[PDB]
Structure 1
Amino acid sequence: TNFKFSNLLGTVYCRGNLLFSPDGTHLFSPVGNRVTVFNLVENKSYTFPFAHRKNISRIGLTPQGNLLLSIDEDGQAILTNVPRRVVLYHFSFKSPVTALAFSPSGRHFVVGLKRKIEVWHVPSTPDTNEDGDLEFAPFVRHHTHMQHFDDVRHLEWSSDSRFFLSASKDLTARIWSLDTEEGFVPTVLSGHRQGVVGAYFSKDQETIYTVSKDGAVFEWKYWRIVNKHFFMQNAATLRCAAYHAESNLLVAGFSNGIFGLYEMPDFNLIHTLSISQNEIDFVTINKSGEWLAFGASKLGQLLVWEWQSESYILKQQGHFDAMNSLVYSPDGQRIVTAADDGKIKVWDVESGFCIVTFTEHTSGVTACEFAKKGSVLFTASLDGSVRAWDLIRYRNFRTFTAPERLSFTCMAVDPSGEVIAAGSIDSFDIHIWSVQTGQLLDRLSGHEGPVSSLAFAPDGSVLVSGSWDRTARIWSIFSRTQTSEPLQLQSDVLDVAFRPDSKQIAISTLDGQLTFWSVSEAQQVSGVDGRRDVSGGRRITDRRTAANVAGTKNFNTIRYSMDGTCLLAGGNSKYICLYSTTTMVLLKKFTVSVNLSLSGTQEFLNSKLMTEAGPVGLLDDQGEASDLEDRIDRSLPGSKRGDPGARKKFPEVRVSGVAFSPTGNSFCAASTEGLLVYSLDNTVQFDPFDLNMEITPASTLAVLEKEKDYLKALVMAFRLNEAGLITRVYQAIPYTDIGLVVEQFPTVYVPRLLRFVAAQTEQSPHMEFCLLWIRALIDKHGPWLAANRGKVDVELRVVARAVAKMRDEIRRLADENVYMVDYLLNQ
């Protein structure tokens, strides 16, 4: 109904510098638009509210780690408040930002522009000044100096924040002040071979280290050089280096995926190992000195490394190709997504990590689904195969395929998961296997084109095929008459989705129109023409205008919500489109991406770009690169779906698949720039239910403390719908009076209460309290819940989620303790 933006998910890393918190337990990882922090000593991730226009170039942090300055390309700056996750200042450096170092005294920051070195005062924030607000132009500038010769790759401060030092792109480093010292002249650290990727201080600020690109690392004293020392490496050049000055150690990541780790008062190898086949982009290093963080920018490939207990505390990766499907477990706690990378991987909704990555397909995984159970992950791929994964044992039962070789593009499993349907583009019959046998049960007829959406009913009596014969089809398999019932449509069927009670079905068809059909007596009940609602216009290489492109004006994927009221709909476009079923009105619409290193974002793309060659973001500037594997264009001419070649500049904006969360209040878009979760935001927006003039928090707490009437206080606090008040009265009434209140409680606030005590069971430390609440609610409200059973089917299942993450998390421990002590007491 009212969905705001929750975490971006499904990409751990994109281009950009990454950083630790000063506590060491938060990792600040840039994804394309945004920055995800994930809490690493207690795994819980969050993405910030903001969203840049381009890809994140950099991030800096205040030493009191409360203030985060991010940079998108062409210098487009932000600084936000990390403890209270709010976005605070906008700024714009005019050059692109290629180096950024925030001062250790929390007072200045040096930015290194494309040759310019500008040192800025950090703005005082409303968290700092006493009676203060946002100023207008808060960034004031302390100095700027452009006495360099080429780009400035790195900036490293001192420890006492009075000198800083610049690692070039020309050949040199330079040592610089903040104010004029009396015996200091600002001076230049001389010749390397290629050009320095770092130049780091010690603790004692006499010897200065400097790390080039051609492997060599020099130690300078006072101003000549005390010892230059290289190290060998066969076919790679040194592309990142971080130096912890307290523990005296230098990491160095390379072009061939390897990093070396060197204790350096004198040159002395601690360790080295290889983590990617591709280059190492960014190295950051913990304040303790114990965790190293490496980002490899080509694939996802974020990893954190304990350098003395030689072990991956983190090694995570996104998808390096377009996704094709996501679903949720029926618990609702993990989303699985498949891609054209070949892997199908299992992501946890909390903690922001992939818990599994299955690599046993090759060549791109099309579809992905569960049964009723949530044990088995049935997936389908262009390898030609439907693999049925065992998700408790993390390995597959049974890989089915077709007798003649196919490449399946669609997949639907029965809810009682003993029947598989799949469907391809090469053949245009529909193949059905049996799971509890292993063979192929049938292949089914009827369609004059490649069947392009398959869906079983959640009853499991009816299969539904939607094909490019501009038709749909009711397949009544399970009885003695395996009969069909066609649905003559107007255009090529793109999608098919079921109402969660199986009495009504929706199809997307290639016009851009959705239509709604009765299933029992097959008959169209309704329909949307959504062609104008979905138009995310004017990709580049469109010489047509934004509103004339047919090709962004259709829905690839549709779902219903778990109530059965709103539909998600989405296509090869920028807008996710949230309709309803009864009144058919477009309820809500979401712009997926604000990005501008994506392609299909700006409709009405501006004419400053179009040079007299064409679009300036269409000129192949790959020869403007200083590395050979960057320069080599090993692409194949004219490949749309997955190729290893992949020039891959300005990818477009699609949603590759939406799905609703099985618990309420959330939303998934499998888009190109990640895997977005939208959530029904409830902690800022006041929304009462049926409220009167007297009912204040002073009135709820008044009948909570003065004259204790617990039913009137409970229905009162529900009737405000404020979480602090329902928590207050909830933890205020006693566990003797629970059965009184629920024994006389109104029937029409019951599923709100079931969702609340389910959340309090799963989150608050009040086991026997909340389980007494659930016991009273189901004991009194038994015939109501069993009689309705579909009106409340989401409320009963967020409860069954809570009383089975309690039944399995601590009573395995209670059983193992009581029988273990029974043994040790038996001797």
Structure 2
Amino acid sequence: MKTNFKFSNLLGTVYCRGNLLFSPDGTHLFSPVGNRVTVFNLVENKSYTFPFAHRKNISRIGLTPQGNLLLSIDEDGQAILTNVPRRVVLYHFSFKSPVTALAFSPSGRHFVVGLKRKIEVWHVPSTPDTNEDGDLEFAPFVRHHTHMQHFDDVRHLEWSSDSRFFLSASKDLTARIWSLDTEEGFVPTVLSGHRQGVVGAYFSKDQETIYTVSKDGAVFEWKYVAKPGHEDMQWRIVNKHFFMQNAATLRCAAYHAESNLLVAGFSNGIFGLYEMPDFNLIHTLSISQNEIDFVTINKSGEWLAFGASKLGQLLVWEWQSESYILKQQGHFDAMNSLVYSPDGQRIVTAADDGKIKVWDVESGFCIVTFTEHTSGVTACEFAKKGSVLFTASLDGSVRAWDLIRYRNFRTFTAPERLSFTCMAVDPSGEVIAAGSIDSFDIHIWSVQTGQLLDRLSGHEGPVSSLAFAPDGSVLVSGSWDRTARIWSIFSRTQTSEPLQLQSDVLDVAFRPDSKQIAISTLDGQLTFWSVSEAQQVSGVDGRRDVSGGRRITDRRTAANVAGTKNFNTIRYSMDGTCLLAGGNSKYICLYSTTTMVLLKKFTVSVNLSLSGTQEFLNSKLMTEAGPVGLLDDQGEASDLEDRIDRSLPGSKRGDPGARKKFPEVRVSGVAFSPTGNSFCAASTEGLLVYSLDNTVQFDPFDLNMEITPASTLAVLEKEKDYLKALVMAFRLNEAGLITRVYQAIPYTDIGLVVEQFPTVYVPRLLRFVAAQTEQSPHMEFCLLWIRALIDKHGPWLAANRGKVDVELRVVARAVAKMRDEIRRLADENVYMVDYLLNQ
């Protein structure tokens, strides 16, 4: 296949440290995830990720109120602004200090940033999308004013509605009223009187009454009335009241001014929202047990967005109907493994948190969570039928769920209690094999009887990787006694051919055409064996090819460090020629299985907040007392719930304390897609789903000198030779041109062009018509095309079956979309109409 894998979207995590946003239309939700910014489109279920990549985690996100410009600032003040309708990075910039507040003016010309003590208001830069004759200048941001008249952290900044005044809410118990330019009857005034520091300072609609909301759970309304001794008036405090959340301090508040309502999110996870000017409690509820990090109201005012930091826990809540709009939960531990569904539309992850969850590929949302496990869940796997999912976890139970009723119809457990860490299933969906660390046997249950079938044995060590053969006849185990075992079970003689290696086995995988096996050992090398004559046919030592390291707390060079120099998990591509390998390191490698060269390397995370994401640290970060990312910085915290250190000493695998400062990066799981064209990797940053780039790259197949888009459209419109025009379009491989031609030819010469089509271009045509079925609104046309293709080249595909399996699978999934989406509807409609006509 074409190894041109750009970075498509992040997935599997929904919210992280950072601040939410709503698009000014009110549909799109901008949420930070690690060091990228994910758009959730809600009016249609979709999601994507902007192509920029920060160096540290996202701290603040602002958006130009027109809607086009987004500006994201990480920690340490590195900032990137991008254009959202054409998703391209535009400008980089460095606020010198950590940014702690950010707000764009509703007039759109200005934006204010609150650094630690400072407040700087800047001009919004002109963009090439906005000006007609303009390109990128060198220094786009123009600083308009500085203000250092504060005394502590500036935590909030809010504009007015006419964009002439703004408010700054500090940590030294003060709000301040600033103006843009010098007004006539204005002074840059202060507002004090509080007990534990202001969280927010908002304006009313008619900008005469303002509100301050303070961390002790208090809210004060200020107005401009005269001093109580009567030119001489003063911004004084007309009334006060308190939220009575008992043992809790409110973290984050927001105020919709057009409707005059205020939402507040506390530390015991119970938020509450209040109709403000008379302070009537509208309602209140508990979204989460931990804390509520950020609230943001819709522009219209009917939707609220809450983000909780310690877990994923993003939720948009629709307050006048008392119901969620979405409540998504990103993993709070390391994702141990994943698999795709054989349809390819949705993927499923098992994490060391205990919960497994099925996410959808489009729309980025977890669509179901299974939580029947009482500890961390190791490997999960599907059958060929794609409706039954088998999970194996550390609680000593291999569970077997159904995906059309969502109930674990089987639970398997060995009689002596083990802790299953690797598993596999016969592709017929009938036999489940599993193995642990605590016992060097390998158990086999059947799924239709429910009892243990047998305990295979012969291993002088714990089994560490398992694989069933995709034809459904061979088991393969790989175990720390430096051995692999070709188990033959289903025949009348259960035999076990040994394969001697040099070191421990860490991963086993099968080629789709089941004749080849690849095993990844502890040296860091891949050995490719042939399953018929059990002889090694290839081998690649990729220790140097994967070594990327120097985690903090490591006194070896990244060159000499051992433990990051192997391949944890390998998988074959759906073509059968590209192996993908990933270990405990920054790099994911992609080899070929015939030429055995490194086709392409990828870096999983440029995020500097994780541990091992650059292979050379610097003496600036090393102080005299060890590394500066190692000093226990918990003590300078204001919340006791964040000050307590309930960590357990020496707990590499997950503990409920989970200090988790600078987590390690590890590519814990990888998997291709059954649709081809994409793969993904569960890493500690999240779940990266890479795809191909076929729209941004011109890649012809076998071009001549005299084939242009102009010449293709000319032989379409002028001479009208549809076959020749279509072959020229596929030869150019420009998707817009191919769509133009294929939509232009009529639906009666389809049999003609398909009969005279070339077999070399058949499979790419099948892939194209399947994608056109899944995307285009010309469904009867596309189905006519597929029927003509299969009725003409029937015996060719059936004779091949190995070169065209992914093409047939994607055609099947598009046709099943059509069938189970519309024809069931038509049948139910016509039967209901028949009964209603027959009374």
User: Taking structure 2 as the reference length, what is the TM-score of the superposition?
Assistant: 0.98
1:266 is displaced (CA, Å) by 1.3
Residue of structure 2 equivalent to 1:105: 107
After superposition, give the CA deviation of every residue in 1:400-449 in whole Å (9 maximum; x if it has no partner).
Answer: 01101110000100000100100000001000000011100001111011
Residue of structure 2 equivalent to 1:287: 299
1:265 is displaced (CA, Å) by 1.2
Aligned equivalents of 1:722, 1:600: Cα separation in 2: 40
After superposition, give the CA deviation of every residue in 1:173-231 in whole Å (9 maximum; x if it has no partner).
Answer: 00000000010001011111101110100101001000000000000001110001112
Aligned equivalents of 2:293, 2:16: Cα separation in 1: 10
Aligned equivalents of 1:565, 1:169: Cα separation in 2: 59
Query: Secondary structure of 1:465's match?
Result: strand
1:742 equivalent to 2:754? Answer: yes
Aligned equivalents of 2:751, 2:243: Cα separation in 1: 75
Aligned equivalents of 2:753, 2:447: Cα separation in 1: 49
Aligned equivalents of 2:262, 2:697: Cα separation in 1: 50
Query: Secondary structure of 2:645's match?
Result: coil
In the TM superposition, 1:731-810 aligns within 5 A as 731-810=743-822
Aligned equivalents of 1:56, 1:202: Cα separation in 2: 30
Aligned equivalents of 2:785, 2:73: Cα separation in 1: 50
1:178 equivalent to 2:195? Answer: no
2:684 paired residue among 663, 669, 672 = 672
Query: Secondary structure of 2:703's match?
Result: coil
After superposition, give the CA deviation of every residue in 1:255-296 in whole Å (9 maximum; x if it has no partner).
Answer: 011101000111110010000001100000000000000001
After superposition, give the CA deviation of every residue in 1:480-526 in whole Å (9 maximum; x if it has no partner).
Answer: 10000000000000000000011000001000000100001110000
Aligned equivalents of 2:444, 2:808: Cα separation in 1: 33
Query: Secondary structure of 1:679's match?
Result: strand
Query: Secondary structure of 1:768's match?
Result: helix
Query: Secondary structure of 2:156's match?
Result: strand
1:811 is displaced (CA, Å) by 1.0
Aligned equivalents of 1:6, 1:81: Cα separation in 2: 17
Aligned equivalents of 1:38, 1:261: Cα separation in 2: 25
Query: Secondary structure of 1:577's match?
Result: strand
Aligned equivalents of 2:397, 2:694: Cα separation in 1: 43
1:624 is displaced (CA, Å) by 1.1
Residue of structure 2 equivalent to 1:85: 87
After superposition, give the CA deviation of every residue in 1:300-339 in whole Å (9 maximum; x if it has no partner).
Answer: 0000000100101010011000011110011001110000
Aligned equivalents of 1:787, 1:184: Cα separation in 2: 85
1:29 is displaced (CA, Å) by 0.4
Query: Secondary structure of 1:229's match?
Result: strand
Structure 1 outlier segments of 4+, above 3 Å: none
1:103 is displaced (CA, Å) by 0.7
After superposition, give the CA deviation of every residue in 1:448-505 in whole Å (9 maximum; x if it has no partner).
Answer: 1110000000011000000000000000000110000000000000000000011000
After superposition, give the CA deviation of every residue in 1:748-799 in whole Å (9 maximum; x if it has no partner).
Answer: 1001000000000111011110011000100000010000001100001100
Aligned equivalents of 2:390, 2:704: Cα separation in 1: 52
Query: Secondary structure of 2:744's match?
Result: coil
Query: Secondary structure of 1:718's match?
Result: helix
After superposition, give the CA deviation of every residue in 1:100-132 in whole Å (9 maximum; x if it has no partner).
Answer: 001101100000000000000000000111111
1:226 equivalent to 2:238? Answer: yes
1:664 is displaced (CA, Å) by 1.2
Aligned equivalents of 2:384, 2:244: Cα separation in 1: 57
Aligned equivalents of 2:765, 2:386: Cα separation in 1: 26
% same residue = 100
Query: Secondary structure of 1:731's match?
Result: helix
Query: Secondary structure of 1:99's match?
Result: strand
1:673 is displaced (CA, Å) by 0.7
Aligned equivalents of 1:226, 1:92: Cα separation in 2: 41
1:620 is displaced (CA, Å) by 0.4
1:582 is displaced (CA, Å) by 0.4
In the TM superposition, 1:237-316 aligns within 5 A as 237-316=249-328
Aligned equivalents of 1:173, 1:97: Cα separation in 2: 18
1:323 paired residue among 311, 335, 338 = 335
Aligned equivalents of 2:626, 2:737: Cα separation in 1: 61
Aligned equivalents of 1:761, 1:232: Cα separation in 2: 57
Aligned equivalents of 1:391, 1:235: Cα separation in 2: 43
Aligned equivalents of 1:308, 1:680: Cα separation in 2: 43
After superposition, give the CA deviation of every residue in 1:784-822 in whole Å (9 maximum; x if it has no partner).
Answer: 000000110000110011111111111111011000000
1:541 is displaced (CA, Å) by 0.3
1:537 is displaced (CA, Å) by 1.2
Aligned equivalents of 1:456, 1:575: Cα separation in 2: 27
After superposition, give the CA deviation of every residue in 1:552-576 in whole Å (9 maximum; x if it has no partner).
Answer: 1000000000000101100111000
Aligned equivalents of 1:792, 1:414: Cα separation in 2: 23
1:344 equivalent to 2:370? Answer: no
1:743 is displaced (CA, Å) by 1.0
Aligned equivalents of 1:710, 1:796: Cα separation in 2: 25
After superposition, give the CA deviation of every residue in 1:48-104 in whole Å (9 maximum; x if it has no partner).
Answer: 000100000000000110000000001111100000000000000001000000110
Query: Secondary structure of 2:568's match?
Result: strand
1:633 equivalent to 2:645? Answer: yes
Residue of structure 1 equivalent to 2:232: none
After superposition, give the CA deviation of every residue in 1:222-258 in whole Å (9 maximum; x if it has no partner).
Answer: 1110001112111110110000000000000010111
Aligned equivalents of 2:528, 2:481: Cα separation in 1: 19
Query: Secondary structure of 1:587's match?
Result: strand
Aligned equivalents of 1:432, 1:305: Cα separation in 2: 47
Query: Secondary structure of 2:805's match?
Result: coil
Query: Secondary structure of 2:582's match?
Result: strand
Aligned equivalents of 1:219, 1:421: Cα separation in 2: 67
Unaligned 5+ segments in structure 1 are: none
Aligned equivalents of 1:105, 1:506: Cα separation in 2: 61
Aligned equivalents of 2:545, 2:308: Cα separation in 1: 39
1:41 is displaced (CA, Å) by 1.1
Query: Secondary structure of 2:767's match?
Result: helix
CA RMSD of aligned residues (A): 0.5
Query: Secondary structure of 1:804's match?
Result: helix
Query: Secondary structure of 1:176's match?
Result: strand
Aligned equivalents of 1:7, 1:815: Cα separation in 2: 38
Aligned equivalents of 1:818, 1:416: Cα separation in 2: 36
Q: Say how many residue pairs are matched.
A: 827
Aligned equivalents of 2:405, 2:436: Cα separation in 1: 29
Aligned equivalents of 2:485, 2:372: Cα separation in 1: 33
1:48 paired residue among 34, 47, 50 = 50
1:536 is displaced (CA, Å) by 1.6
1:348 is displaced (CA, Å) by 0.1
Unaligned 5+ segments in structure 2 are: 225-234
Aligned equivalents of 2:245, 2:263: Cα separation in 1: 15
Query: Secondary structure of 1:469's match?
Result: coil
Aligned equivalents of 1:307, 1:500: Cα separation in 2: 51
After superposition, give the CA deviation of every residue in 1:696-733 in whole Å (9 maximum; x if it has no partner).
Answer: 00011001100100000000000000001100000000
Aligned equivalents of 1:389, 1:685: Cα separation in 2: 42
Aligned equivalents of 1:362, 1:507: Cα separation in 2: 32
Query: Secondary structure of 2:202's match?
Result: coil
Aligned equivalents of 1:231, 1:291: Cα separation in 2: 22
Residue of structure 2 equivalent to 1:28: 30
Aligned equivalents of 1:780, 1:267: Cα separation in 2: 74
Query: Secondary structure of 1:713's match?
Result: helix
Aligned equivalents of 2:134, 2:465: Cα separation in 1: 58
2:499 paired residue among 462, 487, 496 = 487
Aligned equivalents of 2:446, 2:243: Cα separation in 1: 60
1:155 is displaced (CA, Å) by 0.5
After superposition, give the CA deviation of every residue in 1:148-181 in whole Å (9 maximum; x if it has no partner).
Answer: 0000010000001000000111100000000000
Query: Secondary structure of 2:786's match?
Result: helix
Aligned equivalents of 2:296, 2:305: Cα separation in 1: 5
Residue of structure 2 equivalent to 1:816: 828
Query: Secondary structure of 1:805's match?
Result: helix
Aligned equivalents of 1:425, 1:231: Cα separation in 2: 53
1:502 equivalent to 2:514? Answer: yes
